[PDB]
């Protein structure tokens, strides 16, 4: 008895005779869409930067303890970007901070570096902004959300408050031995859960810088228009 083979035939007729409501105070927005389709080539850790957002607990020593009268200003959505700075700022060069709980490295040897230090090319506009002259206001990205024109920068408050922040980094990261308040993943082990350069690639690097340049100029179409707006 057989499964058949190909080529065969067929015949038509004959006789083989709880509706939700909370998109109001959390969610907002409106999205446009055209026949053009919207492009992306970036990762989202670029888009949020700070890989951290946090609780009432570590801000109840901050907001409703003090923030009537902060002698230099201590707002809610400023605590995030300052507290996000330093722990990465000892990450790409000190890995051994984790396994040994007696020895997290302290800010008393972190002063002369982290005033000028870099959260992965952080002021990366300026090597393009020093020619694009957009300093008459501050710089904003499309992955800059609308929360930050009304905020303050960082490097000037270390003159003001900078030695009162890491003091509360220390006393809850270790009771699981080295995890952020939102810990990473099943991150550690994949078990269970719980001769070319002579004629061709001499041309490796130019073919972006010749396009890193005139994009300013085709955007100098509008960047010269900001006095036509005035």
């Amino acid at each position: 008895r057989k499964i058949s083979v190909k080529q065969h035939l067929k015949i038509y007729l004959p006789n083989d005779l709880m509706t939700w409501n909370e998109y109001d105070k959390f969610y907002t927005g409106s999205f446009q869409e055209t026949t053009s389709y919207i492009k992306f080539s970036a990762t989202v850790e670029d888009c949020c930067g700070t890989n951290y957002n946090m609780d009432e607990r570590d801000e109840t020593f901050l907001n409703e303890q003090v923030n009537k009268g902060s002698s230099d200003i201590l707002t809610e959505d400023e605590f995030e970007i300052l507290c996000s700075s330093f722990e990465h700022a000892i990450h790409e060069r000190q890995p051994f901070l984790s396994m040994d709980p007696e020895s997290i490295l302290s800010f008393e040897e972190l002063k002369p570096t982290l005033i000028k230090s870099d959260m992965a090319d952080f002021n990366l506009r300026n090597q393009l902004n020093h020619e694009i002259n957009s300093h008459k206001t501050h710089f904003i990205t499309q992955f800059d959300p609308v929360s930050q024109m009304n905020t303050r920068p960082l490097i000037q408050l270390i003159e003001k408050f900078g030695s009162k922040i890491y003091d509360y980094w220390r006393e809850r990261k270790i009771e699981v031995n080295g995890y952020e308040i939102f810990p990473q993943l099943k991150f550690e082990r994949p078990g269970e859960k719980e001769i070319l350069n002579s004629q061709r690639l001499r041309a490796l690097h130019q073919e972006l810088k010749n396009a890193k340049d005139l994009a300013l100029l085709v955007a100098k179409r509008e960047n010269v228009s900001l006095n036509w707006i005035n």
Partner: peptide, 23 residues
């Protein structure tokens, strides 16, 4: 009093057009 870089940029893009993706 406002066109001082508006005044030249709008042909040079055709030169860069004829620079790298016109071979």
């Amino acid at each position: 009093e406002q066109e001082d870089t508006f005044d030249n940029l709008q042909q040079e893009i055709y030169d860069k057009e004829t620079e790298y993706f016109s071979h």
